[PDB]
Amino acid sequence: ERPLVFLCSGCRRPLGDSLSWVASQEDTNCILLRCVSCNVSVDKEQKLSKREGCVLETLCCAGCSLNLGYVYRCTPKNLDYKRDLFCLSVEAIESYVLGS
Amino acid sequence: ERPLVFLCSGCRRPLGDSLSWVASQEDTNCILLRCVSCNVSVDKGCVLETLCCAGCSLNLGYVYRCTPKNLDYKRDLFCLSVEAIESYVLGS
Ligand SMILES: [Zn+2]
Ligand SMILES: [Zn+2]
């Protein structure tokens, strides 16, 4: 195929690429990355989950402090696969596609 | 192996990527790209118009338009100054 780079919406810093893109979520409109760049920082405050409850710290761009998503830190057995993966909101990243 | 994405030193807009890279050893301060993104705006002894960034105006490089035989490779390629771009490598 052709790989992607994900850029912060608020300032265009590189957040990650499709090489670490493991999975997606249709309802939360997030993509799940195994691996992120130095520009995704982790607000060290554990907040509870408000959906179908996990513990998860929120992600934001080291550059402009835009809210980028969340990481699952603590999860029940059924959600262990999402644990430690970076969920990036689609409404907060912009894709650049390689190949012109 | 893994590809690169080149980006404007000034506003981080994407310029182009290593998929278009032209391996040259003649020039020592420019990356040669066979094609570039919408963000590389071309504006206004070789004739060569100047490249700059469509978002922020930063002088980015140049394009050799008229060349002699020995420079025919550089012709119509976008030379991005490595002092005016940055790169993100995929897999990081
Ligand atoms: Zn940002
Ligand atoms: Zn720029």
Residue numbers in the entry:
A (entry chain A): 78 to 129, 133 to 180
B (entry chain B): 78 to 121, 133 to 180
Provide the authors' own sentences about this structure as they appear in the paper:
A central player mediating this process is the Mis18 complex (Mis18α, Mis18ý and Mis18BP1), which recruits the CENP-A specific chaperone HJURP to centromeres for CENP-A deposition.
The crystals diffracted X-rays to about 3 Å resolution, and the structure was determined using the molecular replacement method. The Mis18α_Yippee_ dimerisation is mediated via a back-to-back arrangement of a ‘three-stranded’ ý-sheet from each monomer. As observed for Mis18α_Yippee_ homo-dimer, the Mis18α/ý Yippee hetero-dimerisation is also mediated via the back-to-back arrangement of the three-stranded beta sheets of Mis18α and Mis18ý Yippee domains. The integrative model of the Mis18 complex fits well in the EM map. Interestingly, the serial arrangement of the Yippee domains utilises the second Yippee dimerisation interface observed in the crystal packing of both human Mis18α Yippee and *S. pombe* Mis18 Yippee (**Fig. S3d, highlighted by zoom in view**).
